[PDB]
Amino acid sequence: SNAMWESKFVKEGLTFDDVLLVPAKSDVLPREVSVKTVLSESLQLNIPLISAGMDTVTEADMAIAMARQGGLGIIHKNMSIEQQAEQVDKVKRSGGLLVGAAVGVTADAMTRIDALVKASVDAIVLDTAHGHSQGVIDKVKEVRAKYPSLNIIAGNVATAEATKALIEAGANVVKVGIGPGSICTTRVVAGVGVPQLTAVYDCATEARKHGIPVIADGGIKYSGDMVKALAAGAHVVMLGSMFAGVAESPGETEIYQGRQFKVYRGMGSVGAMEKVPEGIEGRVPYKGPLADTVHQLVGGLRAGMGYCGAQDLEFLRENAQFIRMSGAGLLESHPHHVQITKEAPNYS
Amino acid sequence: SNAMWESKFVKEGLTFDDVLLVPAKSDVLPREVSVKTVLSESLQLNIPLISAGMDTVTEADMAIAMARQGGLGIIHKNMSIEQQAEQVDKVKRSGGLLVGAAVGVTADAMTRIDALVKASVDAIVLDTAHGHSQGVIDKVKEVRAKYPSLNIIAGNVATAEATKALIEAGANVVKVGIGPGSICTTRVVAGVGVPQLTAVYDCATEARKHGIPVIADGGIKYSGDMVKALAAGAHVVMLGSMFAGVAESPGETEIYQGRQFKVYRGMGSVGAMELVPEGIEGRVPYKGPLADTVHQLVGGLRAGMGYCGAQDLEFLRENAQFIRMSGAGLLESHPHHVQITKEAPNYS
Amino acid sequence: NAMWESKFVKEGLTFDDVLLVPAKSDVLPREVSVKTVLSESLQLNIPLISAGMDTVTEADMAIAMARQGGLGIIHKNMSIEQQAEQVDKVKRSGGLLVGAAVGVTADAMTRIDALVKASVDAIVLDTAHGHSQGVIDKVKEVRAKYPSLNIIAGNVATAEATKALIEAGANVVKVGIGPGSICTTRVVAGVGVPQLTAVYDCATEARKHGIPVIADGGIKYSGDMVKALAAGAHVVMLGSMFAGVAESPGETEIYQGRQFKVYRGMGSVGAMEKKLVPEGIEGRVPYKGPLADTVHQLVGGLRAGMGYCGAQDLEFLRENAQFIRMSGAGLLESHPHHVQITKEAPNYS
Amino acid sequence: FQSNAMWESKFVKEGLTFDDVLLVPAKSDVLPREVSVKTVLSESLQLNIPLISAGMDTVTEADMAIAMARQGGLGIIHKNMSIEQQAEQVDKVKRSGGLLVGAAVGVTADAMTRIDALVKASVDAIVLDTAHGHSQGVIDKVKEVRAKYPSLNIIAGNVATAEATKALIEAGANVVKVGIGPGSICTTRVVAGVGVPQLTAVYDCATEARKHGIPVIADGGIKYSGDMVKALAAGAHVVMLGSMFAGVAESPGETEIYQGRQFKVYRGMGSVGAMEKLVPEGIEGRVPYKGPLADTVHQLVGGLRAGMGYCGAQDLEFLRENAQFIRMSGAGLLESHPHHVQITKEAPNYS
Numbered sequence A: 001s002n003a004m005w006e007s008k009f010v011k012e013g014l015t016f017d018d019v020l021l022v023p024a025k026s027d028v029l030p031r032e033v034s035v036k037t038v039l040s041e042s043l044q045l046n047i048p049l050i051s052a053g054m055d056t057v058t059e060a061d062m063a064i065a066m067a068r069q070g071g072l073g074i075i076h077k078n079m080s081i082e083q084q085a086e087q088v089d090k091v092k093r094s095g096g097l098l099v100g101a102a103v104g105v106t107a108d109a110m111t112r113i114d115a116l117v118k119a120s121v122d123a124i125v126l127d128t129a130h131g132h133s134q135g136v137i138d139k140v141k142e143v144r145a146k147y148p149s150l151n152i153i154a155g156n157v158a159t160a161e162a163t164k165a166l167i168e169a170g171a172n173v174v175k176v177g178i179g180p181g182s183i184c185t186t187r188v189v190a191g192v193g194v195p196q197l198t199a200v201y202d203c204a205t206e207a208r209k210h211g212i213p214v215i216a217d218g219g220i221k222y223s224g225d226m227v228k229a230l231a232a233g234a235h236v237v238m239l240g241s242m243f244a245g246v247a248e249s250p251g252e253t254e255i256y257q258g259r260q261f262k263v264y265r266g267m268g269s270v271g272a273m274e275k276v277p278e279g280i281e282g283r284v285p286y287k288g289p290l291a292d293t294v295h296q297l298v299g300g301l302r303a304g305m306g307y308c309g310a311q312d313l314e315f316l317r318e319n320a321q322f323i324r325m326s327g328a329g330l331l332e333s334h335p336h337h338v339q340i341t342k343e344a345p346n347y348s
Numbered sequence B: 001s002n003a004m005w006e007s008k009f010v011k012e013g014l015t016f017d018d019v020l021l022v023p024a025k026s027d028v029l030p031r032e033v034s035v036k037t038v039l040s041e042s043l044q045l046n047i048p049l050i051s052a053g054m055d056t057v058t059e060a061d062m063a064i065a066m067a068r069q070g071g072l073g074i075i076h077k078n079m080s081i082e083q084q085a086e087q088v089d090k091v092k093r094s095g096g097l098l099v100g101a102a103v104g105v106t107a108d109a110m111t112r113i114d115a116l117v118k119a120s121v122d123a124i125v126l127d128t129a130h131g132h133s134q135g136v137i138d139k140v141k142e143v144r145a146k147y148p149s150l151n152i153i154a155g156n157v158a159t160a161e162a163t164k165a166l167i168e169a170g171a172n173v174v175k176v177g178i179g180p181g182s183i184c185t186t187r188v189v190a191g192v193g194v195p196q197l198t199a200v201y202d203c204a205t206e207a208r209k210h211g212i213p214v215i216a217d218g219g220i221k222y223s224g225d226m227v228k229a230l231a232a233g234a235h236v237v238m239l240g241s242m243f244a245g246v247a248e249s250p251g252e253t254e255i256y257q258g259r260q261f262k263v264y265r266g267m268g269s270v271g272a273m274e275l276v277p278e279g280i281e282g283r284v285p286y287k288g289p290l291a292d293t294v295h296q297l298v299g300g301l302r303a304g305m306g307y308c309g310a311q312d313l314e315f316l317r318e319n320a321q322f323i324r325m326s327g328a329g330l331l332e333s334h335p336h337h338v339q340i341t342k343e344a345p346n347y348s
Numbered sequence C: 001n002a003m004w005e006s007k008f009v010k011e012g013l014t015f016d017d018v019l020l021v022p023a024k025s026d027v028l029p030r031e032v033s034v035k036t037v038l039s040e041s042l043q044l045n046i047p048l049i050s051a052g053m054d055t056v057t058e059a060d061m062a063i064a065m066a067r068q069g070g071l072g073i074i075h076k077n078m079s080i081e082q083q084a085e086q087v088d089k090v091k092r093s094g095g096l097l098v099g100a101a102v103g104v105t106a107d108a109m110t111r112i113d114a115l116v117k118a119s120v121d122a123i124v125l126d127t128a129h130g131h132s133q134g135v136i137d138k139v140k141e142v143r144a145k146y147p148s149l150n151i152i153a154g155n156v157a158t159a160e161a162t163k164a165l166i167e168a169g170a171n172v173v174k175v176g177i178g179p180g181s182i183c184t185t186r187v188v189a190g191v192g193v194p195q196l197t198a199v200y201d202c203a204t205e206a207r208k209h210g211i212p213v214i215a216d217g218g219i220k221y222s223g224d225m226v227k228a229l230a231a232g233a234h235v236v237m238l239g240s241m242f243a244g245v246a247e248s249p250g251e252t253e254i255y256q257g258r259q260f261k262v263y264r265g266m267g268s269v270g271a272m273e274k275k276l277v278p279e280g281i282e283g284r285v286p287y288k289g290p291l292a293d294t295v296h297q298l299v300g301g302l303r304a305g306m307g308y309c310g311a312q313d314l315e316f317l318r319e320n321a322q323f324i325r326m327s328g329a330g331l332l333e334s335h336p337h338h339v340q341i342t343k344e345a346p347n348y349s
Numbered sequence D: 001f002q003s004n005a006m007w008e009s010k011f012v013k014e015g016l017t018f019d020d021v022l023l024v025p026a027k028s029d030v031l032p033r034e035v036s037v038k039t040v041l042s043e044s045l046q047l048n049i050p051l052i053s054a055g056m057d058t059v060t061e062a063d064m065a066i067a068m069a070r071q072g073g074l075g076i077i078h079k080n081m082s083i084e085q086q087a088e089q090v091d092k093v094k095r096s097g098g099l100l101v102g103a104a105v106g107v108t109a110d111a112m113t114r115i116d117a118l119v120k121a122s123v124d125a126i127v128l129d130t131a132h133g134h135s136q137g138v139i140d141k142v143k144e145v146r147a148k149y150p151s152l153n154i155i156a157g158n159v160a161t162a163e164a165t166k167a168l169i170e171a172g173a174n175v176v177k178v179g180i181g182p183g184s185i186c187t188t189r190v191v192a193g194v195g196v197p198q199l200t201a202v203y204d205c206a207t208e209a210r211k212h213g214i215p216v217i218a219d220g221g222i223k224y225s226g227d228m229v230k231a232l233a234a235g236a237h238v239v240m241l242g243s244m245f246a247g248v249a250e251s252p253g254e255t256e257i258y259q260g261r262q263f264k265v266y267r268g269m270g271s272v273g274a275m276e277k278l279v280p281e282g283i284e285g286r287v288p289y290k291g292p293l294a295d296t297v298h299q300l301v302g303g304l305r306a307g308m309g310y311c312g313a314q315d316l317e318f319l320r321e322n323a324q325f326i327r328m329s330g331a332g333l334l335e336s337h338p339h340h341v342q343i344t345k346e347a348p349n350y351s
């Protein structure tokens, strides 16, 4: 019994800023690489980007623009059931685009899920703070029993054991991430978390055994961080802060120092729960149309995949190697000892 | 002999910001967890929080508010014997609440302890800069001889060897912490200390063999640090800076730069002593009623225990696993890359 | 399953992770030799090469570089006729050494012909990713036409890539993916190798063929150069430390009453016009005056480091110098600390 | 093969400095007031406190060496002087009550001429101070001084390795000074890339010197009194301080006022100003005025007594031979300092 006491401090975790991708032999160029991904037979994305289901990130206009760029948007749940079904319905009829919707694990959940399926949603995201809870496992079984063909994205988890549990309950996709969010204070106020790159790797190690894809959710600050998440085993990444400043996102621009900002807050923050916190309320710079951000993101992915000799995302997922570095290595990776004159489209 | 020379740099120590608690399978929700703890046959607490025995944190008005919230207050020793005996009696009169009192290891110590026992004190805290000194060990043995049933809290120590010595001397509770204090300069001016999370774990490993509880004293900056201290083996945590700003603490609010502050200083500082100092004098924001801080602290603990699947503190103490992370992991754990506009009640 | 389980096994070190250990020395800083040979046709008196960037090296910089005992690489953001004119302009000024960068494009061999006609000493087949077959194929195709031409191929960061370019016919391999001061490759693509590990891994392979490597990028102080040479590199390539000298492309600009020079990455938005995704940024460095003053501090720092290590020449430093690893607290100790600096030193700013 | 052994050991060694570690508290029966801080460097050189003021033109002259020795310590008169001035500075300290005093000598052709004038001024120890103590020029000078003066205390430095320590001992040095690059004003590790983290250097050099009965000096990098306790516990007999002494009243240079606060100039002996084209290995700076030396020494020795009590050391030999460290990360360092509290007043030992 003494084993659990002696294993308290054995595990080690890595995050994005701890590693770099090692360049390998390459026969492919960034322009000729493929960035398509399959989450299920009914759900395939042309770019591996999903906008997060938060009240400051994704509504009708964001989900529309995401799908038009080849990605996916998850309409948040901080609205009435009919309002969310009305948002899903807007995205589907506006050219047959893909759309998702967030649902919380509550007694009224199944009523909301039914209304979303009639709007022909492609996937429901049962997103909760702790996916390794029995309430979450049961809700996935109750939805899989009622809708055997519905794409179910279950999260959030950070361990292989939680990944195996949600897969066994009938979830097609597992969303990974406890604590990496830019607006998240879970690790500070509750002390609980797993470094995101290790969380993605540990969960992808289990999901591989079942043919299940995983979503790297939260913590991505630059386009290179997305490449690290995919190379660690993730099929797709979920972004919040990098999308909150975009024009097609809910909320209006506010002025700070002559510059435009958009509100970005955690769904566990005081403000978001009104209509103990595990998030903060803030603002991110205004970034303009989604196409300009998505173009820089995909372009960094194509560059990274060319460096790794990856013709497609599966090759990157199963062959790419990292190298660990210290804090001095992180300062070398960024621009240093030179006064930056202009703001770059991919570096702010 | 050469063994001690070659053993100089073998040990490694971890602090709160080096680790994260791994989320586990959970059948319980934060509202349904138990935060009760037993320190001795005569000492049972409803919340695992003790106010530190400093002239800037806890006097009668603070100890009353602590006990009423389910915790414990330690009346500080910077007083005459007659003043301290009356403070214990004031807290005792207000509904039969639990209260403790700090006593230093000096020739006059037993005279002060006698007056505290007549005021019906529940626990005596034998506070010294170095708990593994022979003068402290002798004082513990003689107080156990004169008062065989009196709760004796002995500290501070940081090693398994020091913990076993105070336990064999007759102390029911051992207080752990050398150098982690927010106002403490021991590790800077004397070079001596042990990282608090390693100190708590090393001492709890020894105290666990005897059924003795340990107190994680100092270094707690956020509610998540308290969850980590308890998951590392501590029954109860002792706070100073997180309590110095509340209304029920000695001293009155001062205005600095148009904002409200309360004085907070170390008991080894120049001001508190009026040897070389091992503390500094400082300032903390006014935080309002004690209940608001206690709610945020306990609420974060309930969240952590729910993330870890702990129904009570013994499950967290015996089963919770940590994961080590780098400074980049710490940067991910905090909010990042978002301009914070509002203050959260648990994150400032 | 090895490839999946080996994802996070490697560890990498950069300049600020290590220090050179002082060794027995009968050598004085003044008496060391800083000469190095890259090929039979390329001998440098100082192991310093100015980078081939449109804000770092043109004719006047290559002239001053060679006159100090080094080498300049004329950048490619110009016409073929302009670059051939820059090479000969440098060559006519006393028969000085000069190189020129050529990208892996359809016109590359057309540009290479014009450079060889100008009596260029080395072409740098410089690409963002040197381990692509387009680069290897281009090296053989250049090696076939010019058996006597010095070919510098980069950039790479692994032992496998060094062996690949050597098999294609490259005399010198340039090492560095992401360490540059103006570089965002590791930020926008997630790809890189810590430069000191990259140099060491490439030198381990390149020594097996007698091939020298160039430590390219990441050098902030003169001591970083000594660490790069002690890690296995024959010569180092500098950009930011040279962009502020008088002999460099661009004109001095005034910022806050002080004089500055533009310094930008060749993968930046501004340099690529001269919607694509950049791998560099546009910046500015303080104006530094004559090139001789910068080189004197650089060579002076190298001479001191070699004296501490007991290396009379650079080959001894390459084969004997020992490092010791340190933490961030060691880096804070290595720099000056707890003292407010009142005057700016020629080597520390 | 042999040629490849040096190539594969390039990145094997690891080094620790003061901010990487903490001293582990041990069983103790002694109190800080009751400990002994006496130390013996040789039979001719015994100090009551283990503190030496550095031989720099902004740290130690006659008035500093006088005040240092009177506190039980030692001052090293710097060498940026003529031979005649340095000998009279030594004589000034000797005439002021027969106090102990040292003098710095560089390894140059004039060295032996300079040393002679110092011995006639009755100096107690000469410091053969060089940027690189493991050079053959330094080894030769120690043998050449040991040949002429068999009883003279010779302090040779600076080194950072066990091999360099053993070489200087074999050349005839009674004391070895350890420190390459840790100085607060030092840029050696930045401009030349060379150094060893000071705590590992002290430990590695004391390991060798212990075998010959030779004491070592921890030179440079000490920012707080706890750094001194760590250096002594890492194997050093005595520590040499510069920045912590450069601000005291009895040190060369005058107090200058900036923004209402009093400052003194503090610069490295490898800075342009002190040597006044060339490549410097130091910078020029400024430190706050600290008042009389007695207040700084009192806080320093007091911090040592506290640490020795935490470690159960009755004297410095017990601390050098028994004290145990524990290693910590950057987060451990932030916990060690005061944190998350706005400091209102300055403590005598902290900032």
Ligand SMILES: CC(C)(NC(=O)Nc1ccc(Cl)cc1)c1cccc(C(=N)NO)c1
Pocket (backbone or CB within 6 Å): A127, A128, A129, A130, A133, A186, A267, A268, A269, A276, A277, A278, A279, B026, B028, B029, B030, B302, B303, B304, B306, B307
């Ligand atoms: C409501 C709140 C503040 N906290 C929790 O629900 N805590 C929590 C839930 C279950 C367990 Cl077992 C432990 C803790 C929240 C709201 C929205 C998002 C999150 C979030 N951290 N991730 O989605 C959290």
Ligand SMILES: CC(C)(NC(=O)Nc1ccc(Cl)cc1)c1cccc(C(=N)NO)c1
Pocket (backbone or CB within 6 Å): B127, B128, B129, B130, B133, B186, B267, B268, B269, B275, B276, B277, B278, B279, D028, D030, D031, D032, D305, D306, D307, D309, D310
């Ligand atoms: C008085 C003072 C400044 N120092 C000591 O008493 N030092 C000390 C005592 C015994 C030994 Cl063997 C070694 C050192 C002090 C006062 C109040 C609290 C502390 C403190 N660091 N923790 O409680 C210290």
Ligand SMILES: CC(C)(NC(=O)Nc1ccc(Cl)cc1)c1cccc(C(=N)NO)c1
Pocket (backbone or CB within 6 Å): A026, A028, A029, A030, A302, A303, A304, A306, A307, C126, C127, C128, C129, C132, C185, C266, C267, C268, C277, C278, C279, C280
């Ligand atoms: C154009 C741009 C921005 N990026 C790339 O060409 N990317 C890239 C090329 C090939 C492969 Cl397989 C993968 C990525 C560039 C331009 C000029 C210089 C560089 C540079 N990093 N080193 O020379 C990069």
Ligand SMILES: CC(C)(NC(=O)Nc1ccc(Cl)cc1)c1cccc(C(=N)NO)c1
Pocket (backbone or CB within 6 Å): C025, C027, C028, C029, C303, C304, C305, C307, C308, D129, D130, D131, D132, D135, D188, D269, D270, D271, D279, D280, D281, D282
């Ligand atoms: C002159 C100068 C700038 N540099 C050297 O003399 N360098 C040096 C000497 C010998 C060898 Cl083998 C290698 C390097 C200097 C002056 C004063 C002090 C120092 C210093 N670093 N410690 O005392 C250095």
Ligand SMILES: O=c1[nH]cnc2c1ncn2[C@@H]1O[C@H](COP(=O)(O)O)[C@@H](O)[C@H]1O
Pocket (backbone or CB within 6 Å): A052, A053, A054, A156, A177, A179, A180, A181, A182, A183, A184, A185, A186, A217, A218, A219, A220, A238, A239, A240, A241, A242, A265, A266, A267, A268, A269, A278, A279, A280
């Ligand atoms: O307040 C919250 N607490 C914890 N995590 C949150 C909260 N709100 C959103 N998140 C997570 O953070 C992700 C976005 O993180 P980001 O892309 O790094 O800003 C979301 O997709 C959610 O998974």
Ligand SMILES: O=c1[nH]cnc2c1ncn2[C@@H]1O[C@H](COP(=O)(O)O)[C@@H](O)[C@H]1O
Pocket (backbone or CB within 6 Å): B052, B053, B054, B156, B177, B179, B180, B181, B182, B183, B184, B185, B186, B217, B218, B219, B220, B238, B239, B240, B241, B242, B265, B266, B267, B268, B269, B278, B279, B280
């Ligand atoms: O001045 C002192 N020097 C060293 N430690 C102190 C001093 N005063 C209080 N402490 C310790 O610091 C703890 C409070 O630390 P905090 O909760 O981080 O502010 C107290 O409970 C004591 O254990």
Ligand SMILES: O=c1[nH]cnc2c1ncn2[C@@H]1O[C@H](COP(=O)(O)O)[C@@H](O)[C@H]1O
Pocket (backbone or CB within 6 Å): C051, C052, C053, C155, C176, C178, C179, C180, C181, C182, C183, C184, C185, C216, C217, C218, C219, C237, C238, C239, C240, C241, C264, C265, C266, C267, C268, C279, C280, C281
């Ligand atoms: O835009 C770019 N992106 C990435 N690397 C670059 C770029 N421009 C120049 N470099 C590299 O950076 C080196 C100079 O870096 P520096 O010495 O740190 O300033 C050059 O010699 C190139 O190898």
Ligand SMILES: O=c1[nH]cnc2c1ncn2[C@@H]1O[C@H](COP(=O)(O)O)[C@@H](O)[C@H]1O
Pocket (backbone or CB within 6 Å): D054, D055, D056, D158, D179, D181, D182, D183, D184, D185, D186, D187, D188, D219, D220, D221, D222, D240, D241, D242, D243, D244, D267, D268, D269, D270, D271, D281, D282, D283
């Ligand atoms: O300019 C220099 N370069 C390198 N080290 C120096 C220089 N000047 C003084 N030192 C060293 O630094 C020590 C004092 O440094 P500090 O006590 O940390 O400020 C001296 O005793 C010398 O060993």
Ligand SMILES: [K+]
Pocket (backbone or CB within 6 Å): A332, A333, A334, A335, A336, C178, C179, C180, C181, C182, C183, C184, C185
């Ligand atoms: K960089």
Ligand SMILES: [K+]
Pocket (backbone or CB within 6 Å): A179, A180, A181, A182, A183, A184, A185, A186, B332, B333, B334, B335, B336
């Ligand atoms: K976070």
Ligand SMILES: [K+]
Pocket (backbone or CB within 6 Å): C333, C334, C335, C336, C337, D181, D182, D183, D184, D185, D186, D187, D189
């Ligand atoms: K230094």
Ligand SMILES: [K+]
Pocket (backbone or CB within 6 Å): B179, B180, B181, B182, B183, B184, B185, B186, B187, D335, D336, D337, D338, D339
């Ligand atoms: K502290």
